[PDB]
Design a binder for these strands. Structure first.
Ligand SMILES: [Mg+2]
Ligand SMILES: [Mg+2]
Ligand SMILES: [Mg+2]
Ligand SMILES: [Mg+2]
Ligand SMILES: [Mg+2]
Ligand SMILES: [Mg+2]
Ligand SMILES: [Mg+2]
Ligand SMILES: [Mg+2]
Ligand SMILES: [Mg+2]
Lengths: 257, 49, 246, 344, 132, 102, 65
RNA sequence: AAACUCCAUAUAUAUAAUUUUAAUUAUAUAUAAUUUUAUAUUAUUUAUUAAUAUAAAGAAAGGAAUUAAGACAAAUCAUAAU
């Protein structure tokens, strides 16, 4: 049995949705519903199987290789990514609603900014946000996820997953929509990925990868359709990063100690 | 003077008080040139090869 | 305030309580740190821990009841805890493995590496049977002298000369050294073979990393074979007088 | 600060190479050129002062010093021996591992929490109290599966609920009643301050025995029972040393006279998980007047043990579940005794 | 005893009143390490000799009465009384090695036999003792 | 004196009752107290006889003694012991066993 | 003088066998902070050998260890 | 039983004014091995192992004494003794 986690200050979120991001109705659409739906579908998928004893992150890792076990992987990836998104947009993790310490504010960590400077071409954080929205609009037509990931090389990239593709596994990123035409370089990258996975000698055909994420923004129409109608997805993401819970984010950065 | 002052910060064995850059507070060794021994001169290596 | 007498070990009623509690402590460490993966490719941080011999463990562990399987399991678990990359280990593991390291190191001295003498000659003494031979080997041309006499005069058999020359042939340096043999004792073969052994010993000083080639050639091993004593109740040793059934 | 350590890490190795190189350099070549320079290379500057100071430095640090000396806390930083990688260099294997842990503690949990799922380790570490044991919990544990009908021992007719799929099914209401009786017999003995021995020799049981013994401050024998351990104690266990403890189970750190050590310590309660194989242990207890608790299957003789617990004995889960309940009851008794002697 | 003496060496040589140094110890041939007092500190006649003395205790002994002692039909009888152990345990565990007296008697064994004459003839009492 | 550690100086043994030795030994192995065995228990043998087994060496004779111990107040025990050295030892083992088997 | 000529030569050959002309190379004080350290530890090794050799020479203990 | 033991072996120290010479020796003490390590091919209770080979570290390979309990009414009263 998979149950939806309890979120802090749940009364505040139930009364009104995340401020500056989603309305009560919208938040109830993403969390408190379509999340219970996700959990129920996953439980019905894995009930009575060894996978039901594992957590969504571990099941998606185990399932990546198996072709026809993709439903469970898809379900688990959605659940994991969704909670990542909710946590990184949560107004305040600390249960200080009774204390009414609204003075709490979240700002990027100096290490995090330093990492942005190292990554890309040393551009400013606002420029990163703008180009991040740019790519989100141009190479994600339907639903998907927006990721700011960190690789083993200590360099942040932006992963434009076009589906429930976990950044953790680059074989399952689902970053290029093949239904539409594809450029030569992208197809070359795909063939290189074909070769890289083929090199692995493990009986399960798996490949090492770390690429754990830092920023999650839900691009599924379960989030903006109501609050931002249609075509306004760009405004939705823009406001999302404007009021992003920074304490969890800069914690996601490996402190190195 | 500064070497003496560095030694003043310690009141223990010469090796421990020395604080070599490569750590190794204890450098116990048996015999002379146990590992290095004597370098085989060129003709010995050539003859062996 | 009340007091009562109880055993030390939770395994006091087991067959070998001491070994069991030591293994229990090691298992607790091994399972509390199931992470911290093992070392990478070996030959860099392995084969450096001597651990403890069976006997040295018994006096502190199983003692009389110490079992071969118990020792193998102990060393197996010690190795598993040793095989953690040192930059993640902590003081608990090292502190517990300090006891099983033991001060296995023994001081060594009196090596006295052989070196060429003031005249650049290597002096060695071989033996065989009842023979001895002191040989001076100095670089030069293939000249040899036994007891001041020529090789052909002293050694009629050509096999003795071949044996003498073998060391200088294993290493292809037959015409680069001058031999001055001074054998004494025994018969010709014992003298010749003692000369060969002494020559092999003397050649090492000239090129120490040629020892193995000679050792594999068998010229650096001393032939322990010698006449065995005539047994009291029988004829020449290992032979008996005729035995009559009736 | 890092500038000193950034210069090839351990710098000054060139001088070590040079002194090694001159180690093989014959002295006869350079000594002549420098022996005669002393009379002419004094030059200017205070030569007497520097030579005298160097001599004093030598005396006090190389000739007159304590080379061998004499006779011979706070975990501030976990992984104190880690070598952090350079800013430009990527992560190392060890930093990758620590980064894995950082993600693992909280992020992997993101998603849906798990409920209503059986985790085997919880049967040892989080056993339930006997009062809240349900018949369903026993049935999930599998204590109701007896040995085949072809193996049945008729002396256990009253304990069996019937036969299903070729095996006898043990009644679980009876198992629960006996288990609670046994559980608070263990608690009473633990509160009294006696010695509890947990015996089990089947493969894979050691973890449960060790955990139960440490919770109840008792003893366990996962190895094979040694005949004569109780009847021939002086010969078997006379060589291993004991201690004196107070009402708080704290050692008194007092030496023991040879007579005290040579005496015999008799368990006040024996718990056996496989009474079919440890028959000699049961016979030693019955002869040595020690109450016993055992898990009785449809193959065992209930009259050998003072306090039977009808149930399955061939499954690790069942024995662990039963033994966990017993251990918790003993632990509660120990806590009650400790509270009473701390405050009456 | 060995550890105590060894520690005395180290303590004496490490300090030696912190006066004697290299080029003064005469490290070439001389072995004069220091005053005799510290060589055998706390190593005197009241502790050392008794605890290193060997062959103190009788652990095993046997007596054999062979002869015509019993007035049986006329035959002979042998009666043996073997008590204890007849091997020295401090020779195979430590580094001291047993020496065979007259090349045929273990040092730990003291044995002898004496004869006499009774009404029936001659008998012999053989006693062998082991002294650990 | 050269008494090694862990041993006691011998004392009166001829007049020391074997009952005391049995009582001390039993208390050492079992939990019984010595005073009751020495004072309130009565020794009286029942069956003393020589028992013979023959081996390759020859006939080997053993002494078999059966004794009873009681307090004349409700408890009684039976014990049998064998020994080849002497019959006093056989009675000792029987006394040991009978006190064990009360 | 306490020799010190060997001191001058070792400073002269400090950069030899690697490169004839090199500057301070971010050293402490023209390579003297840890040079005396190496000389001291070498001398300590000599004294360590002296310790062991004298211990062996004077070693005499009763057998039975 | 094995081990300690002795002859023999390798090495270290000591003694010998190298005319008792041979120092290539003699004999006192000590160390050494009932060898170790690694790899593979085997059958196996699965390296929590045995034999097959290889490799490399070694000078390293023998003989003597000791022949239990009982039995042979074995031999001995001419070794000697009663
Ligand atoms: Mg012959
Ligand atoms: Mg069963
Ligand atoms: Mg001479
Ligand atoms: Mg033998
Ligand atoms: Mg015989
Ligand atoms: Mg026979
Ligand atoms: Mg006859
Ligand atoms: Mg006659
Ligand atoms: Mg006569």
């Amino acid at each position: 049995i998979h149950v939806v986690p309890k979120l802090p200050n749940s009364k505040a979120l139930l009364q009104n949705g995340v401020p500056n991001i989603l309305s009560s109705s919208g938040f109830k659409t993403v969390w408190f519903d379509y999340q219970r739906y996700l959990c129920d579908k996953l439980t019905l998928a894995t009930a009575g199987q060894s996978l039901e004893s594992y957590y969504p992150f571990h099941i998606l890792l185990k399932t990546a290789g198996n072709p026809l076990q993709s439903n469970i992987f898809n379900l688990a990836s959605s659940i994991h990514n969704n909670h990542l998104f909710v946590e990184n947009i949560l107004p305040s993790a600390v249960e200080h609603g009774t204390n009414s310490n609204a003075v709490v504010k979240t700002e990027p960590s100096r290490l995090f900014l330093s990492k942005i400077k190292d990554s890309f071409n040393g551009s400013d954080w606002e420029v990163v946000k703008e180009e991040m929205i740019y790519r989100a609009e141009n190479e994600v037509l339907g639903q998907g996820w927006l990721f700011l990931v960190e690789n083993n090389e200590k360099k942040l990239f932006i992963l434009t997953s076009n589906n429930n593709g976990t950044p953790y596994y680059f074989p399952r990123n689902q970053s290029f929509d093949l239904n539409s035409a594809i450029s030569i370089d992208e197809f070359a990258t795909l063939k290189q990925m074909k070769e890289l996975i083929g090199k692995s000698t493990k009986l399960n055909g798996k490949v090492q990868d770390w690429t754990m994420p830092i920023i999650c923004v839900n691009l599924w129409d379960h989030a903006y359709l109501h609050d931002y109608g249609v075509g306004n997805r760009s405004k939705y993401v823009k406001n999302v990063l404007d009021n992003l819970n920074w304490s969890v984010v800069n914690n996601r950065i490996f402190s190195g100690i | 003077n500064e070497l003496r002052e560095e030694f003043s910060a310690k009141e223990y064995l010469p090796e421990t008080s020395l604080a070599p850059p490569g750590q190794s507070k204890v450098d116990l060794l048996q015999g002379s040139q146990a590992g290095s021994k004597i370098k085989p001169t060129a003709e010995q290596l050539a003859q062996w090869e | 305030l009340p007091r009562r007498i109880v055993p030390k070990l939770a395994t006091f009623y087991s067959a070998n309580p001491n070994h069991e509690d030591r293994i229990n402590r090691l298992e607790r460490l091994l399972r509390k740190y199931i992470k911290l993966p093992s070392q990478n490719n070996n030959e860099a941080q392995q084969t450096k821990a001597p651990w403890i011999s069976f006997d040295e463990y018994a006096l502190i562990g199983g003692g009389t009841k110490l079992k071969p399987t118990q020792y193998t399991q102990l060393l197996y678990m010690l190795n598993k805890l040793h095989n953690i990359d040192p930059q993640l280990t902590n003081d608990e593991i090292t502190s517990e493995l300090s006891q099983y390291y033991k001060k296995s190191s023994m001081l060594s001295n009196n090596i006295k590496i052989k070196t060429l003498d003031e005249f650049g000659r290597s002096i060695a003494v071989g033996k065989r049977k009842s023979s001895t031979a002191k040989v001076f080997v100095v670089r030069g041309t293939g000249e040899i002298l036994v007891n001041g006499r020529q090789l052909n005069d002293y050694f009629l058999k050509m096999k003795d000369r071949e044996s003498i020359m073998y060391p200088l042939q294993v290493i292809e340096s037959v015409g680069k050294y001058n031999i001055f043999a001074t054998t004494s004792g025994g018969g010709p073969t014992g003298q010749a073979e003692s000369i060969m052994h002494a020559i092999a010993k003397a050649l090492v000083v000239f090129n120490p990393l040629l020892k193995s080639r000679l050792h594999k050639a068998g010229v650096l091993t001393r032939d322990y074979r010698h006449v065995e004593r005539k047994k009291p109740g029988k004829k020449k040793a290992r032979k008996m007088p005729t035995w009559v059934k009736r | 600060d890092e500038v000193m350590l950034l210069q090839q890490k351990l710098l000054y190795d060139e001088i070590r190479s040079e002194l090694k190189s001159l180690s093989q350099v014959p002295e006869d070549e350079i000594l002549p050129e420098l022996k005669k320079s002393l009379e002419q290379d004094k030059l200017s500057d205070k030569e007497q002062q520097l030579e005298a100071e160097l001599s004093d430095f030598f005396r006090n640090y190389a000739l007159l010093n304590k080379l061998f000396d004499s006779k011979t806390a706070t975990p501030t930083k976990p992984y104190p021996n880690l070598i952090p990688s350079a800013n430009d260099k990527p992560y190392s294997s060890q930093e990758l591992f620590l980064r894995q842990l950082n993600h693992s503690m909280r992020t992997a949990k993101l998603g849906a929490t798990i409920s209503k799922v059986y985790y085997p380790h919880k049967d040892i570490f989080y056993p339930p109290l006997p009062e809240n044991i349900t018949v369903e919990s026993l049935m999930s544990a599998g204590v109701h599966l007896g040995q085949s009908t072809s193996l049945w021992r008729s002396s256990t007719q009253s304990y069996i609920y019937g036969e299903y799929k070729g095996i006898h099914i043990i009644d679980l209401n009876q198992t629960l009643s006996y288990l609670k009786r046994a559980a608070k017999v263990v608690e009473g003995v633990s509160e009294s301050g006696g010695i509890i021995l947990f015996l089990g020799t089947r493969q894979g049981q050691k973890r449960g025995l060790e955990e139960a013994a440490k919770k109840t401050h008792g003893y366990y024998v996962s190895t094979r029972w040694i005949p004569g351990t109780l009847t021939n104690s002086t010969e078997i266990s006379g060589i291993w040393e004991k201690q004196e403890i107070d009402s708080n189970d704290n050692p008194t750190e007092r030496a023991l006279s040879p007579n005290e050590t040579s005496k015999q310590v008799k368990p006040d309660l024996l718990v056996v998980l496989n009474p079919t194989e440890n028959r000699n242990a049961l016979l030693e207890a019955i002869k040595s007047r020690v109450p016993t608790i055992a898990i009785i299957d449809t193959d065992s003789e209930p009259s050998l043990v003072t306090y039977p617990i009808p149930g399955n004995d061939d499954s690790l889960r069942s024995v662990n579940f039963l033994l966990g309940v017993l251990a918790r009851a003993g632990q509660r008794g120990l806590q009650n005794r400790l509270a009473r002697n701390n405050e009456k | 005893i060995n550890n105590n003496k060894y520690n005395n060496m180290i303590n004496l040589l490490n300090n030696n009143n912190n006066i004697n140094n290299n080029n003064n110890y005469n490290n070439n041939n001389n072995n004069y390490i220091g005053n005799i007092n510290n060589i055998y500190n706390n190593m005197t006649i009241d502790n050392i000799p008794m605890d290193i003395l060997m062959y103190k205790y009788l652990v095993g002994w046997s007596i054999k009465f062979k002869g015509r002692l019993s007035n049986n039909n006329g035959r002979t009888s042998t009666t043996n009384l073997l008590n204890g152990t007849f091997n020295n345990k401090k020779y195979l565990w430590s580094n001291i090695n047993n020496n065979y007296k007259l090349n045929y008697i273990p040092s730990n064994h003291n044995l002898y036999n004496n004869s006499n004459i009774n009404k029936n003839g001659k008998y012999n009492i053989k006693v062998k003792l082991n002294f650990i | 004196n050269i008494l090694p550690p862990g041993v006691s100086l011998p004392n009166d043994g001829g007049r020391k009752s074997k009952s005391a030795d049995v009582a001390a030994g039993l208390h050492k192995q079992t939990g019984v107290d010595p005073d009751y065995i020495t004072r309130k228990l009565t020794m009286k043998p029942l069956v003393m006889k020589r028992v013979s087994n023959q081996t390759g060496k020859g006939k080997i004779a053993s002494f078999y003694a059966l004794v009873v111990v009681g307090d004349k107040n409700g408890m009684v025990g039976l014990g049998e012991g064998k020994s080849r050295e002497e019959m006093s030892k056989a009675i000792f083992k029987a006394h040991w066993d009978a006190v064990r088997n009360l | 003088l306490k020799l010190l000529n060997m001191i001058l030569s070792m400073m002269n050959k400090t950069n030899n066998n690697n490169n004839i002309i090199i500057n301070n190379t971010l050293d402490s004080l023209m390579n003297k902070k840890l040079l005396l350290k190496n000389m001291l530890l070498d001398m300590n090794n000599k004294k360590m050998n002296n310790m062991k050799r004298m211990l062996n020479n004077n070693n005499m203990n009763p057998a039975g260890a």
